Each structure stands twice: as C-alpha cells, then as structure tokens.
Design a protein around this ligand. Structure first.
Ligand code: ZB9
Length: 267
C-alpha cells in the first residue's frame, strides 16, 4: 500500500536513541533521503490500530509537523519511518545553555509549534500529548511537532490515564485531570505549558511539586508564573491557555495571531 515502505530500501547508519517504545536509528531511504527509523518494541503499541491511523497521519502535511513517511509491517519488529531532525529533541535543545538564545528565537519556536497546531486544529486532529519532549529541531533550527496522536496506541498502563506515573499531569487542564475530558482545549492548555517550557529554557513545569501536588495546585485555580525571559505580552499569551473554563481558552488560530503580533512588537 501507499503507507508501506520496503525495508530493503533502508540503509541503517547510526543509533539515535533507545527507550521503552524501541530503538530509533538514522538512515537513508533508497540511498539518498535522510530518515529516522523507529523500531517498535514488541508489546509496546497497539500495532493494527496504529497502522490504520498511519493512513490518516500520512495525509497530514505541514512544514512544521514531523512527516510520517510510512511503515514497515511485514517483519517483526515493525518500523515507523519519519522525517529526520538533525538537532534532536526540543527539550534537550532548550537545556543546552551554549545556544545563548535570544527571546526572538524562543518566540519563533513558539510560532513554529503554533503553526503546526493550527493546522492540526483545522483538521480536527488532537495531539493529545503536546510538550517540549514531543517536538524536534532540524538542522536549520526549525521546531516541528512530533508523535502527534501517538498516545492513543501506547499500551503501557502507567501512561494511559490520569492516575498513571507516566501521564503528562503537568501539561493537563483541570477537566482532563478530574474527568478525562480531552478536546482541542486540552491541546491549548498543553501548548501554554510548552510556551512556558520554551521561555524557561527547559525547566520542568511546577518543578518543586510532585504530580499529585501539581494536580491539587491546578484544581485550586493556581498556575505557573512568568518565566524570567517572557515579556508581559508573551506571559499573557501563555496564561490565556490556562483559563479554568475550557471554552474561554483561545483557539490555535487566535494564539498564532497573538504570537505574530508580539513578534512584530518585539523585533
Ligand atoms: C533523537 N530523535 C530524533 N532525532 C532525529 N530525527 C528524528 N526523527 C524522529 C525522531 C528523531 C528522537 C528524540 C526524542 C525521542 N525519539 C523518538 O523518536 C520518540 N518517539 C518514538 C515513537 C515511537 Cl512510535 C517509537 C519510538 Cl522508538 C520512539 C527519538
């Protein structure tokens, strides 16, 4: 099928990482094209459901989304083939103090993510785990959104629900923590936290709190506060993502307009 890549077309060149979901390698497709090859650990994913969804995911083409090129499903482990992003994970990139980022660079990263999310919003597609650890950085410093929708197919019980140890509590609005109500507005909340991660150079949100303490904090109506590098206008944008009432939170189209306005003011 159009979603199926011949694994014989891959040349494996370097290891990019190993973890719970499997092993990621850098390689070439048909000798010429850079790819990331994700080798899925058996039992970690609902593979048939993922393969069906891969057909939809591949039609999601936007310059700020990490592209899904196809899957290799005729051997074990299956492979997922994606765009290669030379500078790796955004969270680690933010934490490398050598870059000495300007705030204009940080705002540009927020805009890259927002553009990807406005596109997903326009397609009624939820990310469901938006956070700096799920964004990647290419050789030009462009940030792109990765692993969109993947959490629906992860089998690990600690990651599946608000009670689990791996659940992204610190990126979740009160209605997710209390009621499991996911919507565009839970992606909005997570985006505001991602903006906070960017302007905090990769600090853990609510860094002094446990997950349980964070959930209590949020339930009481309290919030993150302003990163030192965020201007008042930037803080207003991120804070708007955290209204207790989900329907009072902006859309990604509004956030993008807000971010572009601040870019103009701060250039
Ligand atoms: C180092 N690195 C990259 N470096 C350059 N270009 C890349 N393209 C894609 C990834 C990438 C990633 C940094 C974050 C962690 N990571 C993942 O891919 C995480 N997601 C995942 C999903 C599935 Cl389904 C299976 C598996 Cl094993 C992993 C590798």
């Amino acid at each position: 099928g159009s979603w199926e890549i011949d694994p014989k077309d891959l040349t494996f060149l370097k290891e990019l990482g190993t973890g719970q979901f499997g092993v990621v390698k850098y390689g070439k497709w048909r000798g010429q094209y850079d790819v990331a090859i994700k080798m899925i650990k058996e039992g970690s994913m609902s593979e048939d459901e993922f393969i069906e969804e891969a057909k939809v995911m591949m039609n999601l083409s936007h310059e700020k989304l990490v592209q899904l090129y196809g899957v290799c499903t005729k051997q074990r482990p299956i492979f997922i083939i994606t765009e290669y992003m030379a500078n790796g994970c955004l969270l680690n990139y933010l934490r490398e103090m050598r870059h000495r980022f300007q705030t204009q660079q940080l705002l540009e990263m927020c805009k890259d993510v927002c553009e990807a999310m406005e596109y997903l919003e326009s397609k009624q597609f939820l990310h469901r785990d938006l956070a700096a650890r799920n964004c990647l950085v290419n050789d030009q410093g462009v940030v792109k959104v990765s692993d969109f929708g993947l959490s629906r197919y992860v089998l690990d019980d600690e990651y599946t629900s608000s009670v689990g140890s791996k659940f992204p509590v610190r990126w979740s609005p009160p209605e997710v923590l209390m009621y499991s109500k996911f919507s565009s507005k839970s992606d909005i909340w997570a985006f505001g936290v991602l903006m906070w991660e960017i302007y905090s150079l990769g600090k853990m949100p609510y860094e002094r709190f446990t997950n349980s303490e964070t959930a209590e904090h949020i339930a009481q109506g309290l919030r993150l506060y302003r990163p030192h590098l965020a201007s008042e206008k930037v803080y207003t944008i991120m804070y708007s993502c955290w209204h207790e009432k989900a329907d009072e939170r902006p859309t990604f189209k509004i956030l993008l307009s807000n971010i572009l306005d601040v870019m103009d003011e701060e250039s």
